[PDB]
Amino acid sequence: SGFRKMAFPSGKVEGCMVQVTCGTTTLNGLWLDDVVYCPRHVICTSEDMLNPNYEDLLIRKSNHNFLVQAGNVQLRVIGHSMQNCVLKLKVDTANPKTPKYKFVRIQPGQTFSVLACYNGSPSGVYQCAMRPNFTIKGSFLNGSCGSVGFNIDYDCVSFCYMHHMELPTGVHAGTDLEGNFYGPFVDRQTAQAAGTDTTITVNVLAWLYAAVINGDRWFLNRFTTTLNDFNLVAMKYNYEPLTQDHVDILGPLSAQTGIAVLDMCASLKELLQNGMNGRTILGSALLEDEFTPFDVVRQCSGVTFQ
Amino acid sequence: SGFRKMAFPSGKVEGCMVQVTCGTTTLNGLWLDDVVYCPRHVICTSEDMLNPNYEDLLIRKSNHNFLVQAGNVQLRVIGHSMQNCVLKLKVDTANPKTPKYKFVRIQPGQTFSVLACYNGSPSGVYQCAMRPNFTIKGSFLNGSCGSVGFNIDYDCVSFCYMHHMELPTGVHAGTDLEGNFYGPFVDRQTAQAAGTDTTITVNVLAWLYAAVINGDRWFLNRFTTTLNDFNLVAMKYNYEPLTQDHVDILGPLSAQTGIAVLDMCASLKELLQNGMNGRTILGSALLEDEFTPFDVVRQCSGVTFQ
Ligand SMILES: O=C(NCC(=O)N1CCCCC1)Nc1ccc2nnsc2c1
Ligand SMILES: O=C(NCC(=O)N1CCCCC1)Nc1ccc2nnsc2c1
Ligand SMILES: [Cl-]
């Protein structure tokens, strides 16, 4: 019973978080085997960030300028390099708490957990999604850069996000663990604006299935629709177009509940056109789009990790 | 920037979770030093739960009937006793991952993190509150009993909740770690209904302060009010009466923002009487009441743990 925004257990990632200080900046790094990964803007002053030439700034840095601390103990840096927008600091000790892991570049609409950290110490954990405009709506303050996002599968941590920037609109931008930004964003203090923050239709529908599983049923109607008919309504409300691939992904939830996907689309259609009339669904007064189909099955299933 | 429902890092608690099986029931236990704590209904069959006599059922149990597993290794049970609604299983090995900890019985309105587990393995983490009717709105399936709720302060885990029951209405009931239920609930499969699920007024006001800190300002008005005037409106909307003690707790957020608490009460009053007119606050279309004042300061502050 019940449905909550649920993050993955964070312990496997907590054991990888370190502090990285270069000259005057301190942020977080990720220690996996004998490499510490962090944002390359650790090498910049606040002034540098208006027009940084990272290769030039890096030339004035040596291994011993990167002060890396795992809890109370210092790590010895024996090499460094820049890969896209991250630095890889080779250290002389493999992290003994390195979990089984992979680096993944996620697609928009996918969800992940964030372990917010400051000065190398974990502060909290919450659940995000990669938005269709390639921002995330996180909770990050100064000093949180280098905090990571991840998913877990059985005993493997798939790292998908590293936090680098806050846009002037208060949303967040960052990279995969190869250091390539999601979307068009850059690690410069400049005018970069987010595009339309469209709604992840397949996730809304998954959440509606979660609601039915839990007794919230008032929005089910006698109607059905078609993909093309539904998508005229999605367009008007700045929803992603629903594809047959989405329908196929919702197959398991459809079979579990006996509600055809297109029937659920017709319920969503009525919700978009008429609103919720002051009612709630799973404790929400709006249509939630940061649960994936897999998220719903998992929470409705009890899937565990190690 | 940003405000999220944020749980504590779960690693310190993950290291304490074990599996407890008695005869035919398997749920979760909490391993701290050389004691494993779990719900006493691990000793019951599904049939027993309609009218269990726990002392009588316990007489037919010995140490070796309690099969306790921490990951893949078996723990040896060398004594057992019942304390209120929990069992304490003495084992012959102190948990090497025992964090610094305390047991606390929380008051309604306080928040905590839940580490949902199945078969001794962590599944996810989320943020709850103790409701004024002494339920919690969690996400628990069969097998999650024994999962715990906790807060962290510096390096100390304060355990406050153990999960025992699901009410027929889909909300959740449980105990502190001394085994005393929150509220009037019992570990019997019977008619126990929840009282009024009132709203935690001081938490709504804290969240409104969080919203102002973050740029969400449209609900600020030119009005003020008094405690007694505001509370006539709280009563009508099934809000907790606001006390001077609540006002004093909101002092830090008031000082940070320069908005007098009673001015914020007048904004909340207008929100209760007029609604949100289809607008949102911090991504929500309703008035959120599961952030405490301390929660807001913490997330708006960057407070870290170890
Ligand atoms: O350097 C910035 N902040 C200060 C800082 O923590 N460091 C700067 C030195 C390098 C690493 C650490 N840049 C920034 C922040 C928020 C923004 N919101 N809109 S533009 C924008 C730019
Ligand atoms: O025993 C129940 N469930 C089955 C079970 O997991 N075990 C029973 C044996 C002892 C431990 C494990 N009781 C219950 C559940 C949900 C309810 N919702 N409303 S009443 C109500 C009663
Ligand atoms: Cl909402």
The Cα B232–Cα B272 span in angstroms is 12
Instruction: Calculate how far, in angstroms, residue A168's C-alpha sits from the geometric centre of ligand 1.
Output: 10
| Best B3, B10, B142 residue to mutate vs chain A (most A CBs within 10 Å) | B10
On whether the CB atoms of residues B172 and B138 are closer than 8 A, the answer is yes
Rg (CA), chain B: 22
Give chain B positions within 8 Å (CB) of A119.
Answer: 304
Burial B1-39 (b: 16+ CB within 10 A, else e): bbbbbbbbbbbbbbbbbbbbbbeebbbbbbbbebbbbbb
> What phi and psi, each to the nearest 5 degrees, are found at residue B266?
-65, -35
Give chain A positions within 8 Å (CB) of B117.
Answer: 304
Three-state secondary structure call for residue B62: coil
On whether the CB atoms of residues B283 and A138 are closer than 8 A, the answer is no
Smallest Cα distance from B106 to chain A, Å = 20
Partners of A17 in beta bridges? A30
B145 is catalytic: yes
C-alpha neighbours within 13 Å on the C-beta side of residue A106: 26
Point out the catalytic residue in the list B16, B145, B160, B265: B145
The Cα A161–Cα A145 span in angstroms is 11
- Nearest by Cα to B2 from A127, A116, A138: A138
The Cα B104–Cα B89 span in angstroms is 20
On whether the CB atoms of residues B134 and B185 are closer than 8 A, the answer is yes
- Beta strand pairing call for B156-166 and B172-175: antiparallel
DSSP strands (E only) in chain A? 17-22, 25-32, 35-39, 66-70, 73-75, 77-83, 86-91, 100-103, 111-118, 121-129, 148-153, 156-166, 172-175
**Would you call A273 an interface residue with chain B, using a CB distance cutoff of 8 Å?**
no
Considering only residues 185 to 224 of chain A, which have any Cβ-Cβ distance to chain B shorter than 8 Å? 214-215
Considering only residues 140 to 159 of chain B, which have any Cβ-Cβ distance to chain A shorter than 8 Å? 140-144
C-alpha neighbours within 13 Å on the C-beta side of residue B13: 33
Give chain A positions within 8 Å (CB) of B172.
Answer: 1-2
C-alpha neighbours within 13 Å on the C-beta side of residue A163: 31
Partners of A238 in beta bridges? none
A142 Cβ below 6 A of ligand 1: yes
**Would you call B284 an interface residue with chain A, using a CB distance cutoff of 8 Å?**
yes
Burial A72-100 (b: 16+ CB within 10 A, else e): eeebebeebeeeebbbbbebeeebeebbe
Point out the catalytic residue in the list B16, B22, B38, B41: B41
**Would you call B168 an interface residue with chain A, using a CB distance cutoff of 8 Å?**
no
Q: What is the DSSP letter of A97?
A: T
**Amino acid in the structure at residue B134:** F
DSSP H stretches of helix in A195-280: 201-213, 227-236, 244-249, 251-257, 261-274
The protein residue with its alpha carbon nearest to ligand 2, atom 14, reads: B189
| Best A113, A139, A216 residue to mutate vs chain B (most B CBs within 10 Å) | A139
> Is A123 in contact with B303 (Cβ distance < 8 A)?
yes
> Is A11 in contact with B6 (Cβ distance < 8 A)?
no
Q: What is the DSSP letter of B284?
A: B
On whether the CB atoms of residues B154 and B179 are closer than 8 A, the answer is no
**How big, in percent rounded to 5, are the helix, strand and coil portions of chain B?**
25, 30, 45
- Nearest by Cα to B107 from B126, B83, B131: B131
DSSP H stretches of helix in B40-111: 54-59
Element (H, E) at B236: helix B227-236
Count of CB atoms within 10 A of residue A29's CB? Answer: 33
Q: Domain B201-300 falls in which CATH fold?
A: main proteinase (3clpro) structure, domain 3 (1.10.1840)
The Cα A218–Cα A274 span in angstroms is 14
The protein residue with its alpha carbon nearest to ligand 2, atom 3, reads: B46
Considering only residues 32 to 61 of chain A, which have any Cβ-Cβ distance to chain B shorter than 8 Å? none
A190 Cβ below 6 A of ligand 1: no
On whether the CB atoms of residues A223 and A267 are closer than 8 A, the answer is yes
Residue with token string 């001394």: B178
Q: Ligand 2: which of B19, B51, B166 to mutate, judged by most atoms within 8 Å of the beta carbon?
A: B166
On whether the CB atoms of residues B157 and B207 are closer than 8 A, the answer is no
Give chain A positions within 8 Å (CB) of B174.
Answer: none
On whether the CB atoms of residues B68 and B77 are closer than 8 A, the answer is yes
